[PDB]
Short mmCIF file of all heavy atoms in Angstrom, two decimals:
data_model
loop_
_atom_site.label_atom_id
_atom_site.label_comp_id
_atom_site.label_asym_id
_atom_site.label_seq_id
_atom_site.Cartn_x
_atom_site.Cartn_y
_atom_site.Cartn_z
N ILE A 1 0.87 -1.19 -0.02
CA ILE A 1 -0.04 0.00 0.00
C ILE A 1 0.81 1.27 0.01
O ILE A 1 0.45 2.28 -0.55
CB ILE A 1 -0.92 0.06 1.23
CG1 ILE A 1 -2.17 -0.77 0.83
CG2 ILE A 1 -1.30 1.41 1.60
CD1 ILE A 1 -2.80 -1.08 2.18
N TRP A 2 2.09 1.18 0.57
CA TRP A 2 2.93 2.19 0.70
C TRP A 2 3.49 2.58 -0.71
O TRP A 2 3.41 3.77 -1.16
CB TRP A 2 4.04 2.02 1.60
CG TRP A 2 4.71 3.33 2.24
CD1 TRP A 2 5.32 4.20 1.61
CD2 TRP A 2 4.34 3.79 3.53
NE1 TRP A 2 5.59 5.28 2.45
CE2 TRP A 2 4.87 5.12 3.70
CE3 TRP A 2 3.58 3.32 4.65
CZ2 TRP A 2 4.86 5.77 4.84
CZ3 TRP A 2 3.46 4.02 5.78
CH2 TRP A 2 4.14 5.29 6.01
N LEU A 3 3.99 1.63 -1.44
CA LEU A 3 4.47 1.69 -2.78
C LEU A 3 3.29 2.10 -3.77
O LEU A 3 3.41 3.07 -4.55
CB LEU A 3 5.13 0.43 -3.32
CG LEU A 3 6.18 0.68 -4.32
CD1 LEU A 3 7.06 -0.57 -4.59
CD2 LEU A 3 5.56 1.15 -5.64
N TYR A 4 2.31 1.37 -3.75
CA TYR A 4 1.13 1.64 -4.54
C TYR A 4 0.86 3.10 -4.63
O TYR A 4 0.52 3.59 -5.65
CB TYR A 4 -0.07 0.81 -4.13
CG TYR A 4 -0.09 -0.56 -4.76
CD1 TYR A 4 1.13 -1.34 -4.87
CD2 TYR A 4 -1.41 -1.07 -5.22
CE1 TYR A 4 1.01 -2.50 -5.44
CE2 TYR A 4 -1.31 -2.32 -5.83
CZ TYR A 4 -0.14 -3.12 -5.98
OH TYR A 4 -0.20 -4.35 -6.53
N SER A 5 0.96 3.78 -3.56
CA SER A 5 0.58 5.13 -3.37
C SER A 5 1.83 6.03 -3.85
O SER A 5 1.67 7.05 -4.33
CB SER A 5 0.34 5.53 -1.84
OG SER A 5 1.49 5.69 -1.18
N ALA A 6 3.00 5.44 -3.75
CA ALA A 6 4.28 6.07 -4.28
C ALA A 6 4.15 6.45 -5.64
O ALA A 6 4.17 7.65 -6.08
CB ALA A 6 5.49 5.14 -4.09
N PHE A 7 4.03 5.41 -6.59
CA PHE A 7 3.89 5.75 -8.01
C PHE A 7 2.58 6.35 -8.36
O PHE A 7 2.45 7.33 -9.02
CB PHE A 7 4.19 4.49 -8.79
CG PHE A 7 5.38 4.61 -9.71
CD1 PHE A 7 6.62 4.28 -9.34
CD2 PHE A 7 5.24 5.27 -10.94
CE1 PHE A 7 7.85 4.46 -10.09
CE2 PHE A 7 6.34 5.43 -11.77
CZ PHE A 7 7.63 5.01 -11.40
N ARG A 8 1.46 5.60 -7.96
CA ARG A 8 0.17 6.09 -8.24
C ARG A 8 -0.19 7.37 -7.56
O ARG A 8 -0.68 8.29 -8.21
CB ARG A 8 -0.87 4.94 -7.89
CG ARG A 8 -2.01 5.11 -8.80
CD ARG A 8 -1.87 4.57 -10.14
NE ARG A 8 -1.42 5.66 -11.10
CZ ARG A 8 -1.03 5.50 -12.34
NH1 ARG A 8 -1.02 4.24 -12.76
NH2 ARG A 8 -0.59 6.40 -13.08
N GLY A 9 -0.02 7.44 -6.29
CA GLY A 9 -0.34 8.71 -5.55
C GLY A 9 0.38 9.92 -6.14
O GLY A 9 -0.22 10.87 -6.29
N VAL A 10 1.63 9.70 -6.36
CA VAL A 10 2.46 10.84 -6.92
C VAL A 10 2.06 11.03 -8.40
O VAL A 10 2.16 12.25 -8.83
CB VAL A 10 3.96 10.55 -6.78
CG1 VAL A 10 4.67 11.64 -7.41
CG2 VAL A 10 4.23 10.43 -5.35
N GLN A 11 1.86 10.02 -9.20
CA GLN A 11 1.56 10.15 -10.59
C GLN A 11 0.20 10.77 -10.81
O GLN A 11 -0.01 11.48 -11.87
CB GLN A 11 1.62 8.84 -11.23
CG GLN A 11 1.05 8.90 -12.68
CD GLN A 11 1.96 9.98 -13.42
OE1 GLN A 11 1.32 10.76 -14.06
NE2 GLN A 11 3.24 9.96 -13.31
N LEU A 12 -0.70 10.63 -9.87
CA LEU A 12 -2.06 11.20 -9.88
C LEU A 12 -2.01 12.60 -9.37
O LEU A 12 -2.69 13.52 -9.87
CB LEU A 12 -2.98 10.30 -9.06
CG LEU A 12 -3.67 9.30 -10.02
CD1 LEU A 12 -4.59 10.05 -11.01
CD2 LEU A 12 -2.64 8.59 -10.94
N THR A 13 -1.29 12.92 -8.27
CA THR A 13 -1.26 14.15 -7.66
C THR A 13 -0.76 15.33 -8.73
O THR A 13 -1.55 16.37 -8.86
CB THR A 13 -0.22 14.22 -6.56
OG1 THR A 13 0.99 13.54 -6.98
CG2 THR A 13 -0.86 13.50 -5.36
N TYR A 14 0.27 15.09 -9.43
CA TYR A 14 0.74 16.00 -10.42
C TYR A 14 -0.36 16.38 -11.38
O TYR A 14 -0.61 17.56 -11.58
CB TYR A 14 1.90 15.39 -11.21
CG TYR A 14 3.24 15.65 -10.44
CD1 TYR A 14 3.88 14.58 -10.03
CD2 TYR A 14 3.65 16.91 -10.32
CE1 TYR A 14 5.13 14.71 -9.42
CE2 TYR A 14 4.92 17.10 -9.64
CZ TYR A 14 5.63 16.01 -9.19
OH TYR A 14 6.83 16.20 -8.54
N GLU A 15 -1.07 15.42 -11.92
CA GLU A 15 -2.22 15.63 -12.79
C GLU A 15 -3.24 16.63 -12.19
O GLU A 15 -3.74 17.51 -12.88
CB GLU A 15 -2.95 14.38 -13.04
CG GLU A 15 -1.92 13.31 -13.74
CD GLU A 15 -2.69 12.02 -14.16
OE1 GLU A 15 -3.87 12.04 -14.07
OE2 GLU A 15 -1.99 11.02 -14.34
N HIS A 16 -3.45 16.41 -10.90
CA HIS A 16 -4.35 17.34 -10.21
C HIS A 16 -3.84 18.79 -10.04
O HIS A 16 -4.58 19.66 -10.21
CB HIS A 16 -4.72 16.85 -8.82
CG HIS A 16 -5.13 15.39 -8.80
ND1 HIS A 16 -5.06 14.44 -7.95
CD2 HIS A 16 -5.76 14.66 -9.83
CE1 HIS A 16 -5.57 13.48 -8.23
NE2 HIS A 16 -6.10 13.41 -9.43
N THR A 17 -2.47 18.90 -9.90
CA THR A 17 -1.86 20.18 -9.79
C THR A 17 -1.80 20.86 -11.21
O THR A 17 -1.75 22.07 -11.28
CB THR A 17 -0.48 20.05 -9.30
OG1 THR A 17 0.30 19.08 -10.05
CG2 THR A 17 -0.48 19.37 -7.89
N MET A 18 -1.74 20.01 -12.12
CA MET A 18 -1.61 20.51 -13.58
C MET A 18 -2.98 21.27 -13.85
O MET A 18 -2.90 22.38 -14.40
CB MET A 18 -1.52 19.45 -14.59
CG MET A 18 0.04 18.93 -14.50
SD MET A 18 1.04 20.14 -15.32
CE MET A 18 2.61 19.15 -14.90
N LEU A 19 -4.12 20.80 -13.50
CA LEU A 19 -5.32 21.40 -13.78
C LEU A 19 -5.46 22.64 -12.99
O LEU A 19 -5.84 23.76 -13.48
CB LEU A 19 -6.53 20.38 -13.35
CG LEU A 19 -7.85 21.05 -13.63
CD1 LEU A 19 -8.80 19.93 -14.14
CD2 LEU A 19 -8.56 21.59 -12.33
N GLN A 20 -5.26 22.60 -11.67
CA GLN A 20 -5.24 23.74 -10.92
C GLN A 20 -4.34 24.95 -11.43
O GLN A 20 -4.73 26.11 -11.62
CB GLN A 20 -4.93 23.60 -9.47
CG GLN A 20 -5.35 24.59 -8.46
CD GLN A 20 -4.76 25.94 -8.68
OE1 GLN A 20 -5.36 26.75 -9.41
NE2 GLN A 20 -3.65 26.15 -8.35
N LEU A 21 -3.14 24.58 -11.77
CA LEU A 21 -2.17 25.55 -12.24
C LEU A 21 -2.55 25.78 -13.70
O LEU A 21 -2.10 26.85 -14.14
CB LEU A 21 -0.74 24.89 -12.15
CG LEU A 21 -0.35 25.01 -10.70
CD1 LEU A 21 0.77 23.84 -10.45
CD2 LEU A 21 0.41 26.34 -10.38
N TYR A 22 -3.28 24.97 -14.31
CA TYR A 22 -3.69 25.11 -15.78
C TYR A 22 -5.11 24.54 -16.05
O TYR A 22 -5.32 23.65 -16.66
CB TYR A 22 -2.71 24.26 -16.64
CG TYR A 22 -2.73 24.72 -18.08
CD1 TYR A 22 -1.86 25.94 -18.45
CD2 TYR A 22 -3.62 24.33 -19.03
CE1 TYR A 22 -1.86 26.41 -19.75
CE2 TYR A 22 -3.53 24.84 -20.32
CZ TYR A 22 -2.73 25.87 -20.71
OH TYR A 22 -2.78 26.45 -21.88
N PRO A 23 -5.93 25.41 -15.42
CA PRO A 23 -7.51 25.00 -15.55
C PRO A 23 -7.90 24.91 -17.12
O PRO A 23 -7.13 24.49 -17.93
CB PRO A 23 -8.09 26.28 -15.03
CG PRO A 23 -7.15 26.93 -14.02
CD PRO A 23 -5.80 26.67 -14.65
N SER A 24 -9.16 24.99 -17.38
CA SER A 24 -9.75 24.87 -18.74
C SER A 24 -11.25 24.89 -18.67
O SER A 24 -11.88 24.55 -17.63
CB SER A 24 -9.23 23.57 -19.24
OG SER A 24 -9.22 22.51 -18.28
N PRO A 25 -11.82 25.31 -19.75
CA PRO A 25 -13.25 25.42 -19.86
C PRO A 25 -14.06 24.33 -19.17
O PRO A 25 -13.47 23.25 -18.90
CB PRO A 25 -13.55 25.33 -21.35
CG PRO A 25 -12.34 26.03 -22.03
CD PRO A 25 -11.13 25.80 -20.93
N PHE A 26 -15.24 24.50 -18.71
CA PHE A 26 -16.13 23.54 -18.00
C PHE A 26 -16.59 22.55 -19.02
O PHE A 26 -17.81 22.07 -18.89
CB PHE A 26 -17.22 24.21 -17.21
CG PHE A 26 -16.56 25.16 -16.30
CD1 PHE A 26 -16.24 26.53 -16.64
CD2 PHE A 26 -16.32 24.89 -14.91
CE1 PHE A 26 -15.84 27.39 -15.84
CE2 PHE A 26 -15.84 25.75 -14.09
CZ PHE A 26 -15.47 27.05 -14.45
N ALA A 27 -15.91 22.20 -20.03
CA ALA A 27 -16.34 21.35 -21.16
C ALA A 27 -16.21 19.85 -20.51
O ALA A 27 -17.16 19.02 -20.73
CB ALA A 27 -15.48 21.38 -22.38
N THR A 28 -15.09 19.59 -19.95
CA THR A 28 -14.93 18.21 -19.35
C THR A 28 -16.16 17.71 -18.55
O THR A 28 -16.42 16.53 -18.29
CB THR A 28 -13.78 18.17 -18.44
OG1 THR A 28 -12.59 18.79 -19.18
CG2 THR A 28 -13.41 16.63 -18.13
N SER A 29 -16.95 18.75 -18.04
CA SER A 29 -18.10 18.43 -17.36
C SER A 29 -17.69 17.67 -16.03
O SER A 29 -17.01 16.67 -16.11
CB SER A 29 -19.13 17.63 -18.19
OG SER A 29 -18.61 16.30 -18.24
N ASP A 30 -18.29 18.12 -14.92
CA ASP A 30 -17.97 17.53 -13.75
C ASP A 30 -19.04 17.83 -12.57
O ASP A 30 -19.55 18.95 -12.59
CB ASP A 30 -16.66 17.96 -13.11
CG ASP A 30 -16.22 17.09 -11.84
OD1 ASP A 30 -15.78 15.92 -12.04
OD2 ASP A 30 -16.46 17.64 -10.83
N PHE A 31 -19.43 16.74 -11.76
CA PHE A 31 -20.47 17.04 -10.77
C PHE A 31 -20.32 15.97 -9.73
O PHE A 31 -19.18 15.57 -9.31
CB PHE A 31 -21.85 16.89 -11.44
CG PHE A 31 -22.12 15.51 -11.89
CD1 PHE A 31 -23.17 14.74 -11.12
CD2 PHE A 31 -21.36 14.84 -12.84
CE1 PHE A 31 -23.43 13.43 -11.50
CE2 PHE A 31 -21.70 13.50 -13.20
CZ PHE A 31 -22.66 12.87 -12.54
N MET A 32 -21.50 15.52 -9.15
CA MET A 32 -21.46 14.51 -8.04
C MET A 32 -20.65 13.22 -8.47
O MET A 32 -20.76 12.78 -9.66
CB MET A 32 -22.84 14.04 -7.86
CG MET A 32 -23.62 15.29 -7.18
SD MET A 32 -25.12 14.70 -6.44
CE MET A 32 -25.55 16.17 -5.48
N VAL A 33 -19.85 12.82 -7.71
CA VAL A 33 -19.02 11.68 -7.93
C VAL A 33 -19.88 10.35 -7.95
O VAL A 33 -20.65 10.11 -7.16
CB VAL A 33 -17.85 11.50 -6.95
CG1 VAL A 33 -18.51 11.19 -5.45
CG2 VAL A 33 -17.04 10.30 -7.29
N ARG A 34 -19.65 9.59 -9.09
CA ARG A 34 -20.44 8.33 -9.29
C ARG A 34 -19.74 7.14 -8.49
O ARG A 34 -18.72 6.71 -9.01
CB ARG A 34 -20.48 8.01 -10.81
CG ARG A 34 -19.21 8.31 -11.49
CD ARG A 34 -19.22 7.79 -12.86
NE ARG A 34 -17.83 7.69 -13.44
CZ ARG A 34 -17.65 7.49 -14.66
NH1 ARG A 34 -18.67 7.30 -15.57
NH2 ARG A 34 -16.46 7.42 -15.23
N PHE A 35 -20.25 6.94 -7.35
CA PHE A 35 -19.68 5.84 -6.48
C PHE A 35 -19.79 4.40 -7.21
O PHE A 35 -20.85 4.26 -7.95
CB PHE A 35 -20.32 5.73 -5.14
CG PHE A 35 -21.78 6.25 -5.26
CD1 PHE A 35 -22.75 5.42 -5.91
CD2 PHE A 35 -22.17 7.50 -4.80
CE1 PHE A 35 -24.03 5.85 -6.00
CE2 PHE A 35 -23.45 7.85 -4.98
CZ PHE A 35 -24.37 7.10 -5.59
N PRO A 36 -18.98 3.66 -7.11
CA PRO A 36 -18.92 2.16 -7.55
C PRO A 36 -20.10 1.35 -7.20
O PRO A 36 -20.62 1.65 -6.00
CB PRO A 36 -17.67 1.52 -7.29
CG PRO A 36 -17.15 2.26 -6.04
CD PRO A 36 -17.71 3.74 -6.17
N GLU A 37 -20.49 0.34 -7.83
CA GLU A 37 -21.52 -0.56 -7.37
C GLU A 37 -20.99 -1.93 -6.94
O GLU A 37 -21.84 -2.86 -6.75
CB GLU A 37 -22.56 -0.74 -8.50
CG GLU A 37 -23.15 0.58 -9.03
CD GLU A 37 -23.83 0.48 -10.38
OE1 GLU A 37 -23.28 0.01 -11.21
OE2 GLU A 37 -24.95 0.79 -10.35
N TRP A 38 -19.72 -2.06 -6.84
CA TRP A 38 -19.08 -3.28 -6.51
C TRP A 38 -18.18 -3.08 -5.33
O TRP A 38 -17.64 -4.06 -4.68
CB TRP A 38 -18.29 -3.86 -7.70
CG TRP A 38 -17.28 -2.86 -8.03
CD1 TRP A 38 -15.96 -2.90 -7.84
CD2 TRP A 38 -17.33 -1.71 -9.02
NE1 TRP A 38 -15.33 -1.82 -8.26
CE2 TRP A 38 -16.18 -1.16 -9.17
CE3 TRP A 38 -18.48 -1.21 -9.60
CZ2 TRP A 38 -15.99 0.10 -9.90
CZ3 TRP A 38 -18.29 0.03 -10.42
CH2 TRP A 38 -17.09 0.58 -10.60
N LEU A 39 -17.98 -1.83 -4.91
CA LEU A 39 -17.10 -1.46 -3.78
C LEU A 39 -17.86 -0.74 -2.71
O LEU A 39 -17.79 0.47 -2.65
CB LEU A 39 -15.84 -0.67 -4.28
CG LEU A 39 -14.71 -0.94 -3.32
CD1 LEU A 39 -13.97 -2.30 -4.05
CD2 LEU A 39 -13.70 0.19 -3.45
N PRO A 40 -18.59 -1.42 -1.93
CA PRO A 40 -19.48 -0.83 -0.86
C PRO A 40 -18.63 0.10 0.13
O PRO A 40 -19.10 0.42 1.21
CB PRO A 40 -20.06 -2.00 -0.15
CG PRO A 40 -19.95 -3.10 -1.03
CD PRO A 40 -18.82 -2.97 -1.91
N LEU A 41 -17.37 0.48 -0.28
CA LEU A 41 -16.52 1.24 0.58
C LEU A 41 -17.00 2.67 0.51
O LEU A 41 -16.95 3.39 1.52
CB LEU A 41 -15.04 1.08 0.18
CG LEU A 41 -14.17 1.00 1.28
CD1 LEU A 41 -12.81 0.60 0.79
CD2 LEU A 41 -14.08 2.20 2.17
N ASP A 42 -17.53 3.15 -0.64
CA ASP A 42 -18.01 4.52 -0.96
C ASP A 42 -19.54 4.51 -0.62
O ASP A 42 -20.07 5.49 0.02
CB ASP A 42 -17.68 5.01 -2.26
CG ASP A 42 -16.26 4.50 -2.58
OD1 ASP A 42 -15.61 4.14 -1.72
OD2 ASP A 42 -15.96 4.54 -3.75
#
């Protein structure tokens, strides 16, 4: 779980920072998060 977050956690964080630092029109469309139907975790 530590490593999994190392590459994935860091590889995903940057992407999130890219948007904030480099936004873009509301075309991508975004709203309520669609929780999974196989992972009762959410």
Side-chain angles (χ1 to χ4, degrees):
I1 274 161
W2 212 282
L3 204 170
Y4 270 43
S5 79
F7 239 95
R8 205 76 268 173
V10 177
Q11 175 52 227
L12 267 287
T13 45
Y14 275 115
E15 297 180 17
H16 305 156
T17 58
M18 288 287 181
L19 182 140
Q20 200 295 102
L21 286 152
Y22 201 87
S24 35
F26 302 85
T28 310
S29 76
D30 188 80
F31 71 115
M32 296 194 162
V33 62
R34 39 172 198 192
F35 31 75
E37 303 166 300
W38 58 99
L39 215 84
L41 226 173
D42 319 343

